[PDB]
């Protein structure tokens, strides 16, 4: 159809460089065929194959390869491409088109034997061009077409051909052969070790990889991995930097080496030159290499220790961060005799927030064997506290782990660190000073094992231990001091069963039971935390049922339609609340499956029925009521279509016997339809909801700004201020496309700020950290007012709130002149 029309238009136009190129470009850029008829269009591609102007033929066969990439065709396209290669071998452009089509066909889908990867490979090998016409690309053709698990000789004699580009493609073919296994041989080591001095770039950066792969294959040459690793270390000293990156990384792919030659790298020389040359690429590659070869080698590690302490002044935050990582990975049975001063003064920086938290992670996993090191580390970290009162929780964690790691070294510090004057009474220190708390949490984390430490405190120190144990139980551990020596699941099931069974009541009794169970479910959700989500889910469902029943018994359906009290209506808005609640079920709650989805979709259908009947009672225009009846019937059609299943499992519901009277609902006056919908909602049965096993409710806590700050944010009229928001998200699926921020100005106008996926963190499996900047501007105010900030959850066409409001003071001023 469309392909035939395009072929007919191309044949009718038949312009050489004008119609063919533009038509092929339009065919590629417009859409994909996505059908088997594209293979028939390949026959159309065979129709224009016999033509001049080979650029058009190259574009056509490129389109043929693109069509083969859609897996529409199979062996017929392969046979046609083989015929075209064997017949239309005309210069480099058509060679490129044919080999690209062959490469696309070989990896299209099958990748199998029986003239699918063997005959094509034989045709590619038998058609080697005389100068660069197919050579590099037929080598990658014979790469991706493995013959059998036994053909390496043709690659082997092509290590010494003319073009360095063909050398690189032979290398990449050798790569893809190794990635399929194929049991590589030993002479590749010889052809590779003669391939280092190619006197040109872009081959050595992969020749080092070939040395690595044929070295870790098996170490048997005369000793094999030592000579190969020495060659790699020689390639570390190359002038070009890309080959240095490749050499350091591909020695970082190694895992076995002789020990003595590994200490030979630093004295008599690779790592003594492998660091201080280039940007973060070479340095990070080399230090990841020393990470792995300090992990593999239990020895040597003092040498990598003092080759990491020198490189603190590299003026790159990435180098600092990954350097903190590269010594926190190797911090096992390693002490710091003299190299601890620089690593504790490296914290001294203006903000360095990621660097600072990495340094606190380093300090809690390090090992040290001296006392004055503890003294200097403590005084420097207290100076950090007095300079940045921001990260007291992080330092409490690292001091806790520092005390837990080694308790013994800090025993003489306690007579010196705190006021323990022998005869003068020690005054009670400030409890709310959040710096004495850190040294206490050190002391009592180091007091768990050593017995000679309770005798060294004072009475106020035991009362401080009492309050720290009762307040921060996750910081100080329980000691042996003489001073300080499911029903919910069954209840939820019983309550849910009592709701489900007790449905044959007077509507007053049903309302009373529903209200009591709502209050019970909120109280249970507030008390519990493991079963809070399921309690809130059941509470939302029963709230929907409660509002539906309460709207069903209304005085609106006791008088006639003209005698309508507009203001006294209570059933009009109830449809909107239950609609918003159905949105709340299907987008707030994390772990849901198709049964919850079908039940809340059915509740949405009941909601739309309530909205339809109240609008039918309000208005008198025949065309709007007829139209809304038609939209409601097609919504019911959509519901039975998308949910064609699960009707046998859900019994005697509103929608089941709705579809029982479905053709009469097609042929009736809309007034008859709306009265039978009233009668339909009156004995519409209450469904049972099987609760999911694991459910969690999504919510947000905006941790900064807190909103209790009395100081205003002050700026100039018509200009913008950026306030940083940090909030914690828990149990939110796909925050990038869903979570947004909303700013309510005190004048009424709102702003819906979309966040960046980069600014979303993932601090674990279940909690996320949103850190963005909010942009505000107005036209001057007479006093600093309260701007509202709230996180919203969006869904597909709607937004519903899920975060606690926060408020900020804003002061826009005019210019001074």
């Amino acid at each position: 159809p469309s392909k035939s029309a395009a072929l007919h238009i191309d044949l009718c136009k038949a312009t050489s460089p004008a119609d063919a190129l533009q038509y092929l470009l339009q065919f590629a850029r417009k859409p994909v065929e996505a059908e088997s008829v594209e293979g028939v269009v390949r026959i159309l591609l065979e129709h224009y194959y016999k033509e001049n102007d080979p650029s058009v033929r190259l574009k056509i066969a490129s389109l043929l390869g693109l069509l083969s990439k859609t897996a529409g065709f199979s062996p017929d396209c392969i046979m046609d491409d083989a015929i075209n290669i064997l017949q239309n071998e005309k210069s480099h452009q058509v060679l490129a088109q044919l080999l690209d089509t062959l490469l696309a066909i070989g990896t299209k889908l099958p990748e199998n034997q029986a003239i699918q990867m063997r005959l094509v490979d034989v045709a590619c090998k038998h058609l080697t061009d005389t100068s660069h016409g197919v050579r590099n690309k037929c080598l990658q053709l014979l790469g991706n077409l493995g013959s059998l698990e036994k053909v390496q000789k043709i690659i082997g004699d092509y290590f010494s051909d003319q073009d360095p580009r063909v050398r690189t493609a032979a290398i990449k073919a050798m790569l893809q052969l190794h990635e399929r296994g194929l049991k590589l041989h030993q002479t590749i080591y010889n052809q590779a070790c003669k391939l280092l001095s190619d006197d040109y770039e872009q081959v050595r950066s992969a020749a080092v990889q070939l040395i690595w792969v044929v070295s870790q294959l098996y170490p048997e040459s005369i000793r094999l991995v030592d000579d190969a690793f020495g060659k790699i270390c020689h390639m570390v000293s190359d002038g070009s930097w890309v080959v240095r990156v490749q050499a350091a990384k591909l020695l970082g792919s190694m895992e076995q080496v002789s020990s003595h030659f590994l200490e030979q790298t630093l004295d008599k020389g690779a790592f003594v030159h492998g660091l201080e040359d280039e940007m973060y690429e070479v340095r990070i590659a080399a230090v990841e290499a020393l990470c792995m070869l300090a992990q593999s080698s239990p020895s040597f590690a003092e040498k990598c220790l003092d080759f990491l302490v020198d490189m603190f002044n590299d003026e790159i935050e990435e180098v600092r961060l990954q350097s903190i990582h590269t010594m926190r990975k190797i911090s096992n049975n390693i002490t710091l005799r003299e190299d601890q001063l620089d690593t504790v003064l490296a914290v001294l920086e203006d903000s360095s927030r990621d660097i600072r938290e990495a340094l606190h992670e380093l300090l809690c996993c390090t090992n040290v064997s001296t006392k004055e090191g503890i003294h200097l580390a403590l005084v420097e970290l207290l100076k950090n506290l007095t300079k940045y009162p921001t990260d007291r929780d992080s330092i409490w964690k690292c001091l806790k782990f520092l005390g837990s790691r080694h308790p013994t070294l800090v025993l003489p510090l306690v007579p010196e660190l705190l006021s323990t004057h022998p005869f003068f009474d020690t005054a009670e220190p400030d409890m709310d000073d959040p710096a004495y708390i850190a040294v206490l949490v050190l002391i009592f984390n180091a007091a768990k094992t050593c017995p000679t430490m309770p005798a060294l405190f004072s009475d106020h120190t035991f009362r401080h231990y009492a309050y720290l144990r009762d307040s921060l139980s996750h910081l100080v551990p329980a000691l042996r001091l003489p001073g300080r020596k499911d029903p919910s699941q069954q209840f939820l099931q019983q309550s849910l069963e009592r709701v489900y069974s007790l449905q044959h009541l007077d509507p007053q009794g049903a309302q009373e039971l529903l209200e009591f169970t709502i209050r019970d479910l909120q109280r249970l959700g507030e008390l519990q935390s493991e079963l809070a989500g399921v309690a809130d889910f059941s509470a939302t469902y029963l709230r929907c049922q409660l509002l539906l029943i309460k709207a069903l018994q209304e005085k609106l359906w006791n008088v006639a339609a003209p005698l309508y009290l507009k203001q006294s209506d209570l059933a009009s808005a109830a449809a909107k609340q239950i609609m918003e609640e159905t949105y709340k079920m299907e987008f707030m709650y994390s772990g849901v499956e198709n049964k919850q989805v079908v039940i809340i979709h059915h509740m949405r259908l009941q909601a739309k029925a309530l909205q339809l009947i109240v609008t039918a009672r309000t208005t008198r225009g025949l065309d709007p009521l007829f139209g809304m009846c038609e939209k409601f019937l097609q919504e019911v059609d959509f519901f039975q279509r998308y949910f064609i299943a699960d009707l046998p499992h859900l019994q005697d519901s509103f929608v089941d016997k709705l579809l029982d009277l479905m053709p009469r609902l097609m042929t009736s006056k809309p007034a008859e339809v709306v009265k039978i919908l009233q009668t339909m909602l009156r004995q519409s049965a209450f469904l049972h909801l099987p609760l999911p096993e694991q459910i969690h409710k999504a919510s947000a806590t905006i941790i900064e700004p807190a909103g209790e700050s009395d100081n205003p944010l002050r700026f100039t009229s018509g200009l913008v201020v950026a306030l940083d928001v940090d909030a914690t998200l828990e149990h939110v699926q796909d925050p990038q496309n869903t979570v947004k921020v909303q700013v309510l100005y005190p004048d009424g106008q709102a702003q819906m700020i979309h966040p960046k996926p980069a600014d979303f963190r993932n601090p674990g499996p279940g909690r996320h950290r949103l850190i963005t900047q909010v942009y505000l501007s107005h036209t001057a105010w007479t006093e600093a007012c309260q701007v509202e900030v709230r996180l919203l959850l969006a869904y597909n066409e709607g937004t519903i709130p899920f975060s606690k409001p926060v408020k900020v003071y804003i002061m826009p001023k005019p210019a001074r002149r």
């Binding site: 470009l25 850029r29 190259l58 073009d163 690429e281 200009l719 960046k756 980069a758 900047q773």
Partner: protein, 633 residues
């Protein structure tokens, strides 16, 4: 020898060249005029932009009410602004080997082609070009990033919708190939594969070809390239200013003795007068600050604004207007002024002689010790508590669709007391004001262009005359505005050539004379055998060592020419010992008979034919006798 043309805009070009075996793709320009078709991106939402009437087609079938929205009789599509990339599907761009970069204005399309194709090659550019290109890339990605907008608009790209759209939205080429902006990772990766070349660095590629830059003078770091073998030279000029400017002046020496002089990157408006035009700049800026009120200048972080600052600094000393302050608002501002200060050896020769003395080359340093120029990273901070009405403000991207320029284009765009001063070409003046009309903001189209116009284009072509000329039709066809006049065109008298967007052109010169090198033993083992005066000859026989696309000759058939005289043949046979040899004549030849070895030889015009018996020593004797009475070829 094929030129593949991938960019349709005249001064943001992309041209692949298949030379010997190389696939040198010259320049990667990202067409930003497509961004003019959208709504702007304000950092804080305005009631005006939020509340605009959505345009509806008369059919009403499509849901394009939420797609595109109209304003003052001009409709724009409401999503993130799209970018007009070249064809990445005309040829397989992984076969592109080396990308050459002329200037930072044609580098903005690099991340797309270098991380969405498979291009494993290298890109070469001068280090001022890569530094200002990095800063402009960060500028663009930051302004497109700040407030995110989702591409929710898709139905306006189908054929029948877009032909049923009104103007200017019909005037859009390949909207399906438009792609959203690029991210941090391919900024970092796109600037890793780049390499640093110098001005006319003799740099070889793959052992086959030679590329080299030249000084251009269009901007700080701009380069004009040459791709050449030893016997042919195709040069690519993209942007030049032989008018008096700040960077190193144009080179006219490596351009000559060439065959192709591709005229990419000429002036946007030929009808201009830059010295008087910046005089007009100073004039209306002075008038607006004299009435009392700020001026708004859309500007790139680099380039012509530097030149502007110089004269503007000088004009303060002529105007007595030191009270009004100067503001430069850009997220790359301090680094932009830094890189303006430091890249000084690439300036003029007398500017180099200014660098001889310990003084700053660019005079904005003198603007900052005089507390005149104040640079800020953003409005978010120090600009709030330092802003002074009236002012001169230099703002973000001149396309008037993203940056801080949209904020000052709002707010202040309410009174006729103020003005906005458009100074930068390749962005349409009336099209930039199109979302902002209706509007009372005073506007002066005062574009400053440094690129050479058609008169010096003619001077350049008659100076270093090529064998072929390649240019777009916008240089051949009269311009759409001043189509009534013939004078400001390309004026050459070979048949010039014309390429449209995505076209294949064969360059009509064929390689025929290539290059070979010989080791001296063969050179000494050759003898001259001069036969016809002035023209020597020599027999050569060797083997050819193949390595690194530079072929050699190493030691391990020449034929006969010249008719033999029969009389001298029989005379030297009689004097060599052979006897009783008898000669008879025919119509055109001679039959000569030797009774020894039973030999009969017939000689005709350009024909000899010996017939002998079973002999060896007399046979080879006759061979060396007859081959020494002629000349070997």
């Amino acid at each position: 020898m094929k030129l593949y043309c991938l960019s349709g805009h005249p001064t943001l070009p992309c041209n692949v060249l298949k030379f010997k075996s190389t696939t040198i793709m010259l320049d990667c320009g990202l067409d930003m005029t497509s961004t003019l078709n959208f709504l702007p991106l304000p950092l804080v939402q305005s009631p005006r932009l939020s509340n605009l009437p959505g345009w509806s087609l008369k059919d009403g079938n499509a849901f394009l009410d939420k797609e595109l929205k109209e304003c003052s009789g001009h409709v724009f599509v409401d999503s993130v602004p799209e970018f007009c990339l070249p064809e990445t599907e005309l040829i397989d761009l992984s076969t592109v080997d080396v990308i050459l970069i002329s200037n930072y204005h044609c580098m903005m399309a690099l991340p797309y082609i270098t991380e969405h194709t498979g291009f494993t090659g290298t890109v070469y550019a001068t280090e001022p070009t890569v530094q200002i290109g990095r800063l402009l890339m960060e500028e663009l990605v930051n302004f497109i990033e700040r407030v995110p907008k989702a591409q929710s608009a898709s139905l306006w790209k189908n054929k029948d919708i877009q032909r049923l759209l009104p103007s200017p939205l019909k005037d859009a080429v390949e909207v399906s190939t438009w792609r959203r902006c690029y991210t941090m990772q391919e900024v970092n990766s796109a600037l890793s594969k780049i390499q640093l070349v110098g001005y006319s660095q003799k740099i070889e590629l793959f052992g086959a070809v030679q590329v080299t830059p030249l000084s251009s003078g269009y901007a700080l770091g701009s380069s004009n390239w040459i791709i050449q073998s030893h016997y042919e030279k195709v040069s690519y000029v993209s942007g030049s200013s032989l008018l008096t400017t700040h960077p190193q002046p144009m080179d006219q020496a490596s351009l000559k003795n060439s065959d192709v002089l591709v005229l990419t990157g000429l002036t946007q408006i030929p009808t201009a007068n830059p010295d008087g035009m910046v005089g007009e700049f100073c004039s209306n800026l002075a008038l607006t600050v004299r009435n009392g009120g700020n001026v708004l200048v859309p500007c790139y972080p680099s380039g012509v604004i530097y030149d502007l600052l110089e004269c503007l600094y000088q004009y303060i000393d002529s105007a007595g207007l030191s009270s009004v302050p100067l503001y430069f608002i850009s997220p790359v501002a301090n680094s932009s002024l830094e890189f303006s200060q430091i890249f000084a050896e690439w300036l003029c020769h007398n500017k180099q002689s200014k660098v001889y003395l310990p003084e700053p080359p660019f005079p904005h340093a003198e603007l900052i010790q005089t507390n005149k120029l104040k640079h800020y990273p953003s409005i978010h901070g120090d600009f709030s508590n330092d802003f002074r009405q009236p002012c001169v403000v230099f703002t973000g991207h001149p396309s008037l669709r993203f940056g801080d320029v949209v904020h000052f284009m709002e707010l202040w765009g309410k009174s006729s007391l103020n003005t906005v001063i458009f100074t930068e070409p390749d962005f349409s003046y009336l099209e930039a004001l199109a979302p902002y009309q209706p509007l009372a903001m005073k506007c002066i189209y005062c574009p400053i262009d440094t690129r050479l116009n058609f008169i010096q284009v003619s001077k350049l072509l008659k100076e270093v005359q090529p064998l072929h000329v390649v240019c777009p039709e916008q240089y051949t066809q009269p311009p759409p505005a001043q189509s009534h006049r013939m004078d400001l065109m390309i004026d050459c008298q070979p048949p010039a050539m014309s390429y449209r967007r995505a076209e294949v052109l064969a360059l009509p010169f064929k390689r025929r004379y290539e290059k070979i090198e010989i080791m001296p033993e063969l050179a000494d083992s050759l003898v001259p055998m001069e036969i016809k005066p002035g023209i020597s000859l020599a027999t050569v026989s060797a083997v050819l060592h193949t390595k690194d696309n530079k072929h050699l000759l190493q030691p391990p058939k020449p034929l006969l020419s010249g008719s033999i005289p029969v009389e001298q043949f029989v005379q030297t046979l009689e004097k060599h010992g052979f006897s009783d040899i008898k000669v008879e004549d025919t119509a055109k030849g001679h039959i000569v008979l030797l009774q020894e070895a039973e030999t009969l030889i017939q000689i005709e015009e350009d024909s000899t034919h010996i017939i002998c018996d079973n002999d060896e020593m007399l046979r080879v004797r006759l061979r060396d006798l007859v081959l020494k009475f002629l000349q070997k070829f």
